[PDB]
Design a protein around this nucleic acid. Structure first.
Ligand SMILES: [Mg+2]
Ligand SMILES: [Mg+2]
Ligand SMILES: [Mg+2]
Ligand SMILES: [Mg+2]
Ligand SMILES: [Mg+2]
Ligand SMILES: [Mg+2]
Ligand SMILES: [Mg+2]
Ligand SMILES: [Mg+2]
Ligand SMILES: [Mg+2]
Ligand SMILES: [Mg+2]
Ligand SMILES: [Mg+2]
Ligand SMILES: [Mg+2]
Ligand SMILES: [Mg+2]
Ligand SMILES: [Mg+2]
Ligand SMILES: [Mg+2]
Ligand SMILES: [Mg+2]
Ligand SMILES: [Mg+2]
Ligand SMILES: [Mg+2]
Ligand SMILES: [Mg+2]
Ligand SMILES: [Mg+2]
Ligand SMILES: [Mg+2]
Ligand SMILES: [Mg+2]
Ligand SMILES: [Mg+2]
Ligand SMILES: [Mg+2]
Ligand SMILES: [Mg+2]
Ligand SMILES: [Mg+2]
Ligand SMILES: [Mg+2]
Ligand SMILES: [Mg+2]
Ligand SMILES: [Mg+2]
Ligand SMILES: [Mg+2]
Ligand SMILES: [Mg+2]
Ligand SMILES: [Mg+2]
Ligand SMILES: [Mg+2]
Ligand SMILES: [Mg+2]
Ligand SMILES: [Mg+2]
Ligand SMILES: [Mg+2]
Ligand SMILES: [Mg+2]
Ligand SMILES: [Mg+2]
Ligand SMILES: [Mg+2]
Ligand SMILES: [Mg+2]
Ligand SMILES: [Mg+2]
Ligand SMILES: [Mg+2]
Ligand SMILES: [Mg+2]
Ligand SMILES: [Mg+2]
Ligand SMILES: [Mg+2]
Ligand SMILES: [Mg+2]
Ligand SMILES: [Mg+2]
Ligand SMILES: [Mg+2]
Ligand SMILES: [Mg+2]
Ligand SMILES: [Mg+2]
Ligand SMILES: [Mg+2]
Ligand SMILES: [Mg+2]
Ligand SMILES: [Mg+2]
Ligand SMILES: [Mg+2]
Ligand SMILES: [Mg+2]
Ligand SMILES: [Mg+2]
Ligand SMILES: [Mg+2]
Ligand SMILES: [Mg+2]
Ligand SMILES: [Mg+2]
Ligand SMILES: [Mg+2]
Ligand SMILES: [Mg+2]
Lengths: 146, 204, 118, 65
RNA sequence: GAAAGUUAUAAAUGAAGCGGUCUGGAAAGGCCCGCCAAAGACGGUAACAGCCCGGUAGUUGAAAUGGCUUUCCCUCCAGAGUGGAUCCUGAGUACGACGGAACACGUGAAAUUCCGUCGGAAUCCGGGAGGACCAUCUCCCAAGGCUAAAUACUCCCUAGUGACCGAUAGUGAACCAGUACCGUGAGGGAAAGGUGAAAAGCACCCCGGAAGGGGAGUGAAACAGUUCCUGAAACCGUGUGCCUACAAGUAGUUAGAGCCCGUUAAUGGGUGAUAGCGUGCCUUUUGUAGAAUGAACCGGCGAGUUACGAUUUGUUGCAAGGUUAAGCGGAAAAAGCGGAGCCGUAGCGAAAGCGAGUCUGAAUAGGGCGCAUAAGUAACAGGUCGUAGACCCGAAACCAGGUGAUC
RNA sequence: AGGUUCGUGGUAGGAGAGCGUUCUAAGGGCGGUGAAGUCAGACCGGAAGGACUGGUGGAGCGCUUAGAAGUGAGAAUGCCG
C-alpha cells in the first residue's frame, strides 16, 4: 500500500470520549457524575465489597476445607485423540510429548474413556481408568502400567 | 515469471520466483496494521513536565484562611497560579508494541507481492563496482529507467554499492536480510539482485 | 505536543460582538453582555415569528369589520354569509378589496346578503 | 501492579464448571438446640452466590477464588 | 623500570557555476543550460545555496603530558602415593530459661537468624540440618578472614537524538538571579527577549530655556528614530449621516413612515418618529426576575491523564490449539534464534481419590455441581473498575530537624 | 438506491455522527508579482464552522489520507497584566 492512502480496517479503531468540554456533547458541567455525593468527588467511591456498614457477604458465611501439600494432578488423554496413530504402535509418554498432544506432564499421564477407538495399539501410561482399559482390550490392544 | 536483465540494460534471460512469496493475494489490513506498529516504535518519547510537587518553592500558605477578603489559597505553585505546576501533561513513556509473528510474515509477503502485481519490481543478475563512484551509479540508475525513489537489495558481494550510492537522495541499499515492511512501503520501486532473491525466498 | 490557545478564541468572540452591533452602550462592545443580548434577541425573534401571523390576522379582521359596517352588516354576519354561499376568499384579500377596490367588496357583500337571507 | 486477590473470600467460595461461585450456608455454628432437624438438614448443604452479590464481588475473586 | 603499539588533549589538506536572463533594496528564488559527489550534515552570507564562506566524506598529523594493551625486566614459589597406633580440626561458644527483634510468618503446633541477663556441652566411638519433637535415612563440618564480573546512581566531560517548550511556556533564573525586595534570624523570593542587511543613529534651517515638534537628508521602509518586528480588546478622544427636551425604558424583537446611502447584487445597507410583546447569565433548589450565591471590564493561563492488572464489545492472524518472557543478534532498526512459562482441550470432592462422571448417603434411591448441548488464544482500539495524589482548588490540625529573650 | 407507515419538548443520564487547534509520515502544492498574523465587508454550509476581495504586515504556510495529544473557557470571593 502507499503511505499517502493508508486506511485501517473499519470498526477496528474508535474515537476517545472526552468529558467536560461544553454542554453540547452531553458530558459537560458535571461530566457524567451526577450531583453532590461521595461518588461525585475526586478519588471518591468505596471499597470493592463495601455495603455501607452492613456486614459483607463473605463475613457471614463460614470457611471450609484445607489444602493438601501432596496433591497430585495428572495430564488427561482421551480415547478419540488416541485414534490418530497407526496401529501396532507402542504408545509412550515420551512419544505423546514428542507428537505435541501433551505439552507438560504434571504428575503422570492418565487416559480416560470418552470417545471411541478401533485400532490395535499397545499403550503404557502412569494410570488408567477402568473403562479406558476395558475399551483398549475391547479393540484387541494391550495395556501396561509404567 | 519475470525477466532477468543485466546492469547495462540488456536482457539477461528469464527468472522465476516462488509463488508462495511473490504470488499470494495481498492482505491490505494486515499491512496497514504492521506499518502503524513499525512506525510507532521508532519514536523516542522523551518529554516531561513538572507537577506542583516538583516546581521550586511552595509549602508556605500565602495568607490566612479567613478574614482577609481574598480567595482561599494554599500554595504559590498551585495549577491555577501563573508560575504553578502542570496538572497532567506529558511524561516519559515508551510507544513500542509488537504483534504476532505469523501476522508480520503475512504482511511482508503481501507487501512484497504487491510490488510484482504492479510491475514495480526489477530483478537483475548482478551489480558490482570496481571503485566507489556516484557518477557511475547515477548513470546506472538512468540506464534502468527508474527516475523515482528506489530501494536496492544486494545479497553477498555487491563490491561497494552502499558507498557509491550513499549520496543520492531517494536511494537506499539494504543487505537482503534487513528487508522490512516499512522500508519497502517507503520507496516506490524495488531493484533486487538475483542473488538476493534466493536469500529472501529461503528465509520466508 | 503543547497546543497553545491562539487565534481561535478571538475569532469566535468577535463574531458575537459583531452580531450585537447597534445595541446601547456596552451591549455592542463587551463580549459577556453581547452574548446575552444575542441569545435574547434570537429567542425574541423566534417568538415574534409566531406572533406576527396573529397580529396581521387581527388587523385584517378589524379592517374587514370596519368596511362591512358601512353596508349594514357585521363582520360576523358577513363571514357567515360568505361561508354559506361558498366563497373561499381569505381575510387578507378581503381586506385588500376593502382598502382599495371597495366596489368589488360591495359586490361580495351583496352576494353574502343574498345567501344569508335566501 | 497486578491487583490482589481478596484472601478472606478465597477461603469461602468455589468456582464451578460454568464460571459461577459456590458457597456454604451460614447458620451452623453453636445454637443447634434452637432450630429444628429439617432446618439443620437443609443448612448442611451448599448454595450458590446470587446474581446481585455476584455483580458486586466479581473483581475481588477474579483469579481462581 | 624499560620497549613497542594505540588512544585523549591543538591542527593540515580537501571536488564542483563570479553561467545567461526576469522581478527585486539585495538572489540563495522563477526560466534555460552545465558540473562534482566515499563530499546532497550543519551554520553564515542583503529572501529558500551540493558548486560564495566556515566546513563535510576521505586521507594525514604530536614537541609535551595523561590513559590502556602486549613484550622484556623484576619478584616469588614444592606436589603425588602408601599406612592409622598416637595427636590436631575455632569454649564461657553451641545450645537452654526469661524479655525483645528480623525472617512473607502478629507466639502461634513455630523450625531458622540476632540482641540483653543468667545457666551451660561433646569434641571423629564426634557434631549440625532436612519448619515442634523421637527413631531410620540423606546431605553437610559452625563458633577466623579475603575475593574481580554480571547490579544501582550522574555534580561533571566529549559526540549526538527527540511525532519536548518557545518568553504568563521551558529551570526560580534565555537579560550582571538566588540578584532587587521582605525578615532580628532560620528563611521566602520576583519583573525584565526582538531598530535595521549595514548606524548609514536624522548635517543644516525654523518655534522653545529645554523637552518636543515641522521641513531637509540616510534608508527598501522613519506610520522602522535608542521597550525601536507585528500592534488585538478594554479604556481615552476629534469630525460627521440619522434620531432626541410631555417622556415611566433587562434596553431588545415584530409591524413601520421619513431621511441618508449604493453591496461578495439580493425579495440590499444606516438611523429610526409611532404601535404590539417582553422581569439578565451561572450555581443550588419542591420552587429563583429574585430582596439567595458569583462575576468592575478586557487579554493570557486554568480541571478525567499516564503506568501496571481485571472484565466486556469491535477488528485481525492462527485454530484443538494459541503464544512467547528474560536474553543472543543488530543501526535507540527488521528478521532469525530462544518453548522456561501462561491460557485452553474435564469435572466432582474439605481430602485420600475417582473420572463423563463425581459428592452426599447403607442405597442400583433421590438430589447438588458437570457431560451430553465443545472454541480458544495473541495483539490492537473503545467503555468501566482496582493500586498509585487519580478530576481541579480549599482546612482547622499532627509529627521531625532547626531559628528566635534587640519586643 | 427508491418507496409505505409511524414519529422528531426535554433536566440527571445512555448511544451515534462530526467541526476546529498543535505536531508527525507520504503525496501534491503557493509564496518578495507579497506567507502567517491583524482590520473591514451586504458571501457559503443543518451546527460546530469555511471561503473571496481590499488595507496594514514583511517571511513563511496550506491541501488530501492516516497517526499522536499539554484539545476548544464566561463564571472557581480563580492567578498575572
Ligand atoms: Mg466521539
Ligand atoms: Mg444530558
Ligand atoms: Mg458550564
Ligand atoms: Mg455542584
Ligand atoms: Mg450521586
Ligand atoms: Mg514543593
Ligand atoms: Mg508543609
Ligand atoms: Mg515553570
Ligand atoms: Mg510548538
Ligand atoms: Mg484560553
Ligand atoms: Mg437602533
Ligand atoms: Mg477444585
Ligand atoms: Mg461445627
Ligand atoms: Mg581547506
Ligand atoms: Mg574547495
Ligand atoms: Mg532590476
Ligand atoms: Mg539564480
Ligand atoms: Mg554570500
Ligand atoms: Mg525579508
Ligand atoms: Mg535567512
Ligand atoms: Mg571450623
Ligand atoms: Mg540450632
Ligand atoms: Mg524467646
Ligand atoms: Mg548423626
Ligand atoms: Mg529444605
Ligand atoms: Mg521434618
Ligand atoms: Mg569457615
Ligand atoms: Mg511575544
Ligand atoms: Mg519564565
Ligand atoms: Mg536586611
Ligand atoms: Mg536586531
Ligand atoms: Mg532637537
Ligand atoms: Mg526633527
Ligand atoms: Mg521628513
Ligand atoms: Mg528616498
Ligand atoms: Mg525582519
Ligand atoms: Mg512598535
Ligand atoms: Mg484599538
Ligand atoms: Mg400631559
Ligand atoms: Mg417631543
Ligand atoms: Mg417598542
Ligand atoms: Mg428552601
Ligand atoms: Mg435589585
Ligand atoms: Mg454558598
Ligand atoms: Mg459580589
Ligand atoms: Mg478471533
Ligand atoms: Mg514455539
Ligand atoms: Mg447425579
Ligand atoms: Mg479515574
Ligand atoms: Mg538562642
Ligand atoms: Mg429530542
Ligand atoms: Mg412534538
Ligand atoms: Mg456517552
Ligand atoms: Mg503572484
Ligand atoms: Mg513589482
Ligand atoms: Mg503555525
Ligand atoms: Mg492579509
Ligand atoms: Mg479546514
Ligand atoms: Mg487546556
Ligand atoms: Mg476573566
Ligand atoms: Mg487585577
Amino acid at each position: 500500500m502507499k503511505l499517502h492512502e493508508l486506511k485501517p480496517s473499519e470498526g477496528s479503531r474508535k474515537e476517545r470520549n472526552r468529558v467536560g468540554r461544553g454542554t453540547g456533547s452531553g458530558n459537560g458541567k458535571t461530566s457524567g457524575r451526577g450531583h453532590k455525593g461521595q461518588k461525585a468527588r475526586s478519588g471518591g467511591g468505596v471499597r470493592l465489597g463495601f455495603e455501607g456498614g452492613q456486614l459483607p457477604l463473605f463475613r457471614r458465611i463460614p470457611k471450609r476445607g484445607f489444602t493438601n501439600i501432596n496433591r497430585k494432578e495428572f495430564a488427561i488423554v482421551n480415547l478419540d485423540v488416541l485414534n490418530r496413530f497407526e496401529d501396532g504402535t507402542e504408545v509412550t509418554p515420551e512419544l505423546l510429548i514428542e507428537t505435541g498432544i501433551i505439552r507438560n506432564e504434571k504428575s503422570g499421564i492418565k487416559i480416560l474413556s470418552d470417545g471411541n477407538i478401533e485400532k490395535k495399539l499397545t499403550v503404557k501410561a502412569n494410570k488408567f481408568s477402568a473403562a479406558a482399559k476395558e475399551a483398549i482390550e475391547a479393540a484387541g490392544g494391550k495395556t501396561e502400567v509404567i | 515469471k519475470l525477466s532477468l536483465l543485466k546492469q547495462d540494460g540488456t536482457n539477461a534471460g528469464e527468472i522465476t520466483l516462488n509463488d508462495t512469496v511473490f504470488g499470494i493475494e495481498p492482505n491490505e489490513k494486515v499491512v496497514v496494521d504492521v506499518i502503524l506498529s513499525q512506525r510507532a516504535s521508532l519514536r523516542q518519547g522523551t518529554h516531561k513536565v513538572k507537577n506542583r510537587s516538583e516546581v521550586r518553592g511552595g509549602g508556605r500558605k500565602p495568607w490566612r484562611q479567613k478574614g482577609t477578603g481574598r480567595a482561599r489559597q494554599g500554595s504559590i505553585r498551585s495549577p491555577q497560579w501563573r508560575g504553578g505546576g502542570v496538572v497532567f501533561g506529558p511524561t516519559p513513556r515508551s510507544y513500542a508494541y509488537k504483534l504476532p509473528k505469523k501476522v508480520r510474515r503475512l504482511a511482508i509477503k503481501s507487501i512484497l507481492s504487491s510490488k510484482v502485481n504492479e510491475e514495480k519490481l526489477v530483478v537483475l543478475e548482478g551489480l558490482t563496482f570496481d571503485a566507489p563512484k556516484t557518477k557511475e551509479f547515477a548513470a546506472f540508475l538512468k540506464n534502468i529507467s527508474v527516475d523515482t525513489k528506489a530501494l536496492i537489495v544486494v545479497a553477498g558481494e555487491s563490491e561497494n554499492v552502499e558507498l557509491s550510492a550513499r549520496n543520492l537522495q531517494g536511494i537506499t541499499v539494504i543487505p537482503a536480510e534487513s528487508i522490512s515492511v516499512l522500508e519497502v512501503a517507503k520507496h516506490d520501486k524495488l531493484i533486487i539482485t538475483k542473488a538476493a532473491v534466493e536469500k529472501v525466498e529461503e528465509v520466508l | 505536543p503543547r497546543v497553545k490557545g491562539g487565534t481561535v478564541t478571538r475569532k469566535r468572540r468577535k463574531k458575537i460582538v459583531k452580531l450585537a452591533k447597534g445595541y446601547y452602550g456596552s451591549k455592542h462592545l463587551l463580549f459577556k453582555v453581547a452574548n446575552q443580548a444575542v441569545m435574547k434577541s434570537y429567542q425574541y425573534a423566534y417568538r415574534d415569528r409566531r406572533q406576527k401571523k396573529r397580529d396581521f390576522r387581527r388587523l385584517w379582521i378589524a379592517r374587514i369589520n370596519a368596511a362591512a359596517r358601512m353596508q349594514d352588516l357585521s363582520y360576523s354576519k358577513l363571514m357567515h354569509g360568505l361561508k354559506l354561499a361558498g366563497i373561499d376568499i381569505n381575510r387578507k384579500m378581503l381586506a385588500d378589496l376593502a382598502v382599495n377596490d371597495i366596489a368589488s367588496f360591495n359586490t361580495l357583500a351583496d352576494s353574502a346578503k343574498k345567501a344569508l337571507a335566501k | 501492579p497486578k491487583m490482589k486477590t481478596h484472601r478472606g473470600s478465597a477461603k469461602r467460595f468455589k468456582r464451578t464448571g460454568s464460571g459461577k461461585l459456590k458457597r456454604r450456608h451460614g447458620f451452623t455454628s453453636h445454637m443447634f438446640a434452637n432450630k429444628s432437624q429439617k432446618q439443620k438438614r437443609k443448612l448442611r448443604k451448599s448454595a450458590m452466590v446470587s446474581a446481585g452479590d455476584f455483580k458486586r464481588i466479581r473483581q475481588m475473586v477474579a483469579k481462581m477464588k
